[PDB]
Design a protein around this ligand. Structure first.
Ligand SMILES: CCCc1cc(=O)oc2c(C(=O)N3CCCc4ccccc43)c(OCCN3CCN(C)CC3)ccc12
Ligand SMILES: CCCc1cc(=O)oc2c(C(=O)N3CCCc4ccccc43)c(OCCN3CCN(C)CC3)ccc12
Ligand SMILES: Nc1ncnc2c1ncn2[C@@H]1O[C@H](COP(=O)(O)OP(=O)(O)NP(=O)(O)O)[C@@H](O)[C@H]1O
Ligand SMILES: Nc1ncnc2c1ncn2[C@@H]1O[C@H](COP(=O)(O)OP(=O)(O)NP(=O)(O)O)[C@@H](O)[C@H]1O
Ligand SMILES: [Mg+2]
Ligand SMILES: [Mg+2]
Lengths: 388, 388
């Protein structure tokens, strides 16, 4: 092999297709137990087989829609549509559209810049302490790159125009945008056909659809003040507590007693529910409407408080040494939080790494919450084990 | 705020400094319990305060040295030097140097291309099934960018020349390389002064030095056939079992009985040790000499086999329902493996996501290993709990 064959340079766009894993996650199938929203049983925990990268390109567009609530607090609605037969996904939101105007530095229309060029974002000035999920300037381009067709439609009354542009063939082909007079209610709609060949798939199957559907339920629970519709029907979830009920309202512990679920909205930025786990530590958490499926410092921050107080309670009845990991082993925690300028160790944002001192707010759970936590069966489970 | 202030485009080099977390991990301090190699006590588990990104720029250069064993199986030695007072770290390796010749496409010297330009690698052709840790073409440039001074010295008898070039100021300044006749034993030496201001540090303190030192011990344990020296002294670790002994040889269980440690070299590519954990599930694992500190599919692959067999053993004595997570709760596993073309969800490579069918080898543990595993106290701990 010559020097030029061994030592190679790639462009950024080449690198994304060659090394998708750090951008969107694995492009190969994964089987694991997780929660999905199925057509027959609704929310349930089962083995699911799906391609992470396909989940993530959908998630990037969904979180971008949620992020628009920060740009326009008057936004009220996100509508998600998935048609497996035609292979078309659309995510629509109201509130302010994107300025339909030429960027005076980049010399292209703003929507074309931020959907068609890498490393473009409204989230690069961190002196603005924002609680958007967007941070890196990649997500929408990654969806475009992994789509055979990707259409951006946006209408912005302030600029008196609507914009529609379509990319094809993994963001490699496009054509002139359609610009028209607009004076109505603003919106943005992203419509895409995922490139299933990139994921070794023939069709959007039941498992990936059930996962994407569950993300829409997540958003109904996590994004305050935004209603979510899925395939033309409003999701009947009106806040985080009602979302948590989808997991725990009909569940019993192993002794046949209903799970006792405790809740506190500590402040606008921290919503916490807690109950007993009999399957080891479990957390369901969102940072800025991102599902932090590997957790992070926000989970540790909440859990450590509970663990500390419950250790105190057990100690007043253990006259041996009960260890924090043993207490955490019995906790199922649900957290919805808003973090200023969060950091993550990957574009997929599964693990939120920002230290609590930088969150921009605190979650100081009340003594009433801690007393309630001491009554949800965790203390009993620890004490019963102190006999062994 | 105008359109041009809100919507911004960044260059790749700008993006790395603005968003370091997905490239090198957090640039803010972290405190956590982990294993380090201290000057007073050697290997020990304690709270450590360190900046992950600084650990990682060192790790990138260390794993690059280990990777040279794949390019030249005759390599025998890596030498690591850390001087906190002068702020100089050097990592030297023998075996083949890098070709000191002009790349005919990029029109620069090969070492200058692959240490001074982003997205450059010898690991971009995946039809070669390699067991190097390098995959993405970033690591060495990331160290350069996060260094106030970064020097590459390499000597390659085949090309009859040595090369020395220095970059300064976060890879923003350099000068003409020094090219000289060379006809001796090949080597490469990377010498850098980390930009501590990027990590809000004044000096390489005891904690970061103890972590970097431990990585050198890891390499002595993980990289077959390569001796490691640290500050001029050979590390007395001669293979993976002797490395594992640093953790477990002097440890007792809570009843005062020495931990029973079982071992199998299943084949050249899989080395496994196992013992009892009393602190919840624990794994220490390496993929291609990378410390996979969040685990991955290689850990699950090994652990699931053990868990399955131990469930069988318990069942022959539990005449209630013992769950896999309960068995895993008692496992401390150590794994050193070589995986073809591994994938990870981040440049920091903490979590290896490649599915087992793609590993290029299997680890089928023997019935003798499983019998030994049934005698290391895990089964006893599970059964004792079956009484409760
Ligand atoms: C690569 C993508 C991985 C992933 C994507 C995704 O969307 O959800 C995931 C969820 C999950 O379903 N949820 C539900 C709500 C969103 C959320 C936020 C944080 C944590 C979890 C979740 C998940 O749950 C595992 C549940 N355990 C399974 C068995 N175990 C014993 C106990 C429970 C594991 C991975 C994912
Ligand atoms: C951001 C960087 C994080 C990190 C970097 C690094 O180098 O090592 C780490 C290790 C660690 O020391 N080792 C030792 C050898 C290399 C290795 C490979 C896989 C897993 C672990 C490790 C670590 O251990 C936690 C040990 N538990 C702590 C308490 N707990 C109850 C039980 C034990 C946690 C994080 C890191
Ligand atoms: N639905 C939307 N409504 C309004 N603006 C949007 C919408 N979707 C995307 N944008 C804009 O397009 C930009 C680019 O989106 P994207 O590529 O996802 O980057 P990001 O969200 O800023 N960061 P990240 O998702 O972490 O890579 C965003 O910064 C927003 O300004
Ligand atoms: N010590 C070394 N000896 C020989 N070649 C080296 C050495 N260090 C680096 N290289 C070469 O320099 C290239 C660039 O290194 P690097 O930037 O770390 O990328 P990588 O190791 O290929 N992939 P990654 O580390 O995953 O970003 C490697 O691909 C090797 O060809
Ligand atoms: Mg985004
Ligand atoms: Mg490398």
């Amino acid at each position: 092999a010559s020097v030029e064959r061994v030592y190679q340079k790639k462009t950024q766009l080449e690198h994304i297709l060659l090394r998708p894993d750090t951008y969107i996650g694995s492009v190969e199938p994964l089987t694991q137990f997780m929660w999905v929203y199925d057509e027959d049983v609704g929310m349930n925990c089962r083995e699911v087989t799906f391609v992470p990268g396909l989940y993530k390109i959908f998630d990037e567009i969904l979180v971008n829609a949620a992020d628009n609530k920060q740009r326009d607090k008057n936004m009220t609605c996100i509508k998600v549509s998935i048609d497996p037969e035609s292979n078309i996904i659309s995510i629509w939101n109201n509130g302010k559209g994107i300025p339909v105007v030429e960027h005076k530095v980049e010399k292209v229309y703003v929507p074309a810049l931020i959907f068609g060029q890498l490393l473009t974002s409204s989230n690069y000035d961190d002196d603005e302490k924002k609680v958007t999920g967007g941070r890196n300037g990649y997500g929408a381009k990654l969806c475009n790159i992994f789509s055979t067709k990707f259409t951006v439609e946006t209408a912005c009354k302030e600029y008196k125009h609507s914009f529609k542009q379509t990319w094809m063939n993994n963001m490699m082909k496009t054509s002139e945008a359609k610009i028209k007079h607009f004076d109505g209610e603003d919106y943005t709609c992203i419509t895409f056909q995922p490139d299933l060949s990139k994921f070794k798939m023939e069709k959007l199957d039941k498992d990936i659809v059930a996962l994407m559907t569950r993300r829409a339920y997540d958003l109904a629970g996590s994004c305050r003040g935004v209603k979510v519709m899925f395939n033309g029907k409003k999701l009947p979830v009106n806040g985080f507590r009602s979302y948590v009920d989808l997991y725990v309202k009909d569940k019993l512990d192993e002794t046949g007693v209903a799970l006792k679920v405790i809740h506190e909205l500590a402040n606008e930025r921290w919503d916490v529910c807690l109950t007993l786990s009999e399957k080891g530590f479990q957390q369901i958490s969102f940072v800025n409407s991102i599902a932090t499926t590997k957790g992070g410092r926000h989970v540790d921050y909440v859990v450590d408080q509970v663990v500390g107080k419950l250790i105190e309670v057990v100690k007043k009845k253990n006259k041996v040494s009960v260890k924090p990991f043993q207490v955490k082993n019995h906790i199922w925690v649900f957290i919805n939080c808003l973090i200023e300028n969060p950091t993550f160790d990957s574009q997929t944002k599964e693990n939120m790494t920002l230290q609590p001192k930088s969150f921009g707010s605190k979650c100081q759970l009340s003594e009433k919450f801690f007393k309630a936590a001491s009554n949800c069966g965790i203390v009993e489970s620890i004490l019963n084990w102190v006999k062994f």
